[PDB]
Structure 1
Amino acid sequence: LSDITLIKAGASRAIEKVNECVKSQSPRINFCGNGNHILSLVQNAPYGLL
């Protein structure tokens, strides 16, 4: 029950990364990646995303 909170935080972070890095293009700085960032793709890794 404590680890589901970390998985839900990672779910919200990958939801915002899906929305503003992959599924659109965000004007924000230093969110996707590390800075000096271009775009992103996605791939179903086991039990998460890649």
Structure 2
Amino acid sequence: SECVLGQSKRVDFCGKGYHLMSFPQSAPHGVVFLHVTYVPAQEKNFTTA
């Protein structure tokens, strides 16, 4: 109800990172979620005030 039917702001609820979406899949006696998330990359230092 939270991951699929909208976007989630709870940390580490729908995947690891900033959540984007989720896709459900059926499974025998269970369910599988395919969470699509967003992760940063190469960074750089700067001087801030």
Q: TM-score, normalised by structure 2?
A: 0.49
Question: Which structure is higher in helix share?
Answer: 1
Question: Which structure is higher in strand share?
Answer: 2
Give 1 or 2 for the bigger CA radius of gyration.
2
